């Protein structure tokens, strides 16, 4: 017979599935993997845009030991992207990833608790605010749980509007009960550094953040401003993907991972670490 598997999954094989010896590869017996960022019901955090339809299946709710909800982003069926600052909540600056992992709790879908096998931090997580979460077992991909795809292009070109879903705090500084999203346009880079540092030249940069803390701004980050309704991302939205809908192929790509969520509405730009910058590292890390 022919091997085919159910919805939300694509056959991972070389030649069809007709077989038990296959005339194409022999006895490979292929297993089929999930689908990049094709939400069943796609969309179209201080502000609104309630995620009523479950339009962001990649979004995961990560809660630390001391009950500070943060964000994570399903990138494949077993791994998630978050920020290193999210993993280091309620941990020493010298803490390793071995003892960060048992601390964390992770929710995908409605409330589907997923156990975390290991956490791996970016080698330069002081400059690239990224950590990778690995689940014990592959999560079941359905209309509420589905990985976002890692982009083949750089959708961080100024003016692009990506959807930032989030489990973070709202206009009442209360962690949102329901997942929300905002439509944030990527801003001019020089404007963002000039807004946070001084003058985009290292000898004249100053801690000029409208909020107390400074974001990690470098060549691996981009910035998205508030929407037309003066809504932005607030605490707990870090680790959430700057999801960009490519209308050409109707696919959703994690263009950036929200690193600086401390821009609730005071600082004009939230800083997202480019996924294209970290893509090689995350692939090399999935490989093992």
């Amino acid at each position: 017979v022919r091997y085919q598997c159910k919805n939300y999954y694509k056959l991972r094989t070389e030649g069809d599935g007709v077989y038990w010896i296959n005339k194409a590869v022999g006895d490979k017996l292929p297993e089929c993997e999930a689908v990049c960022g094709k939400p069943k019901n796609p969309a179209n955090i201080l502000g609104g845009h309630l995620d009523a339809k479950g339009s962001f299946p990649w979004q995961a709710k990560m809660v630390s030991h001391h009950n500070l909800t943060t964000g994570a982003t399903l990138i494949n069926e077993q791994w998630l992207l978050t920020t290193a600052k999210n993993l280091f909540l309620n941990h020493s600056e010298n803490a390793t990833a071995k003892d960060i992992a048992p601390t964390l709790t992770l929710y995908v879908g409605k409330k589907q608790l997923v156990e975390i096998e290991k956490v791996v931090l970016h080698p330069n997580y002081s400059q690239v605010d990224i950590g990778l979460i690995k689940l014990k077992q592959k999560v079941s991909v359905n209309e509420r749980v589905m990985p976002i795809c890692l982009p083949s292009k750089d959708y961080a070109e100024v003016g692009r509007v990506g959807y930032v879903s989030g489990w973070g705090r709202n206009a009442n500084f209360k962690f949102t009960d329901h997942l929300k999203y905002v439509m944030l346009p990527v801003a001019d880079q020089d404007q963002c550094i000039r807004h946070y540092e001084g003058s985009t030249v290292p000898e004249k940069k100053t801690p000029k953040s409208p909020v107390g803390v400074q974001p990690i701004l470098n060549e691996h980050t981009f910035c998205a401003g508030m929407s037309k309704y003066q809504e932005d991302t607030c605490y707990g939205d870090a680790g959430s993907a700057f999801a960009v809908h490519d209308l050409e192929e109707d696919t959703w790509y994690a263009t950036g991972i929200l690193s600086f969520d401390k821009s609730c509405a005071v600082a004009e730009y939230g800083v997202y670490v480019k996924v294209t910058s970290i893509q090689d590292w995350v692939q090399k890390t999935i490989a093992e």
Partner: protein, 320 residues
């Protein structure tokens, strides 16, 4: 082509079942994506089956088999066929056979209403039959107009219609109907505005009931105060003893009771006990009423049973 015969499969009869359209020589199903009462009404008027009782998309009618013709449809309600909405393309979809959409129509429905576990046949926990299965009704949004519609539908004296199951326990099964909004002129409880069938945010403690009466068997006296116009408010409805819960029981309802018994206005919602009285499980609940009413029964939306006055206290009164 204008020759697309449509059928409903595995739903008991012709007007209920899973939608199935024959195009290009093959029978295919419809996704439940963006499926609401509008698509259901369109399908029901396609087969001349009347209005749409409800829709279903969890493949409760059974798993589909064939090419899913429709995935996402934008139907406002007034269409001449299902293949007139923004079906976003023919054959193209993102579902499986477990996501297929069915519909139950008025002609094919076996909808019925009944009263169970009440003092009389006119009162008890209200139960509604959906695809032959008897479920209950959540008391959220259940008011005197819904109760009047139910009493008229079932058929027994509807002069006084009160909400709330009389001494009835928690129902079992499904909660088919929630947040019913009748205006009092609907022929039946299912022609009113309500939530989608089976979809609810309640439990079986919130099960709705009704009390149908002509008004002759509603008695309300004061017990334990020696004086006829002082004591707790004891309520006789259909030979059932009961006492009014004091939640939403101010001095206005107290003076309504005093005027009903004929002792002027109300002084305080407390009485100097003259004699012990027993305790009864069922309670009368008074949401609110203006206070000028000549009787407590005549003021709007009083519930008889269906809730416990445990967090609150008994309702007392000392008239003058």
């Amino acid at each position: 082509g204008s020759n697309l015969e449509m059928r409903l499969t595995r739903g008991g009869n012709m007007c209920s079942g899973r939608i199935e359209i024959k195009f290009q020589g093959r029978w295919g199903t419809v996704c439940d994506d963006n499926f609401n009462i509008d698509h259901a009404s369109v399908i029901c008027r396609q087969l001349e089956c009347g209005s749409a009782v409800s829709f279903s998309g969890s493949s409760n009618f059974g798993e589909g088999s064939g090419p899913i013709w429709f995935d996402d449809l934008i139907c406002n309600g007034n269409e001449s066929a299902l293949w007139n909405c923004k079906h976003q393309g023919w054959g193209k979809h993102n579902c499986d056979h477990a996501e297929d959409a069915g519909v139950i129509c008025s002609k094919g429905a076996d909808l019925s209403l009944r009263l169970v576990d009440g003092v009389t046949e006119c009162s008890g926990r209200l139960e509604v039959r959906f695809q032959g299965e008897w479920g209950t009704i959540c008391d959220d949004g259940w008011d005197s107009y819904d109760a009047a519609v139910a009493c008229k539908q079932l058929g027994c004296p509807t002069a006084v219609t009160a909400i709330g199951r009389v001494n009835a326990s928690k129902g079992f099964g499904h909660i088919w109907l929630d947040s019913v909004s009748c205006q009092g002129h609907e022929p039946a409880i299912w022609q009113c505005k309500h939530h989608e069938w089976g979809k609810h945010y309640c439990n079986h403690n919130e099960d709705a009931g009704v009390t149908c009466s002509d008004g002759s068997d509603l008695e309300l006296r004061l017990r334990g105060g020696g004086s006829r116009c002082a004591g707790t408010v004891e309520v006789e409805i259909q030979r059932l003893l009961g006492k009014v819960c004091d939640r939403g029981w101010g001095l206005k309802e107290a003076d309504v009771v005093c005027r009903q018994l004929g002792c002027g206005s109300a002084l305080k919602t407390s009485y100097q006990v003259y004699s012990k009285i027993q305790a009864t499980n069922t309670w009368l609940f008074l949401s609110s009423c203006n206070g000028n009413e000549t009787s407590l029964w005549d003021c709007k939306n009083w519930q008889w049973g269906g809730l416990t006055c445990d967090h609150y206290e008994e309702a007392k009164i000392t008239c003058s």
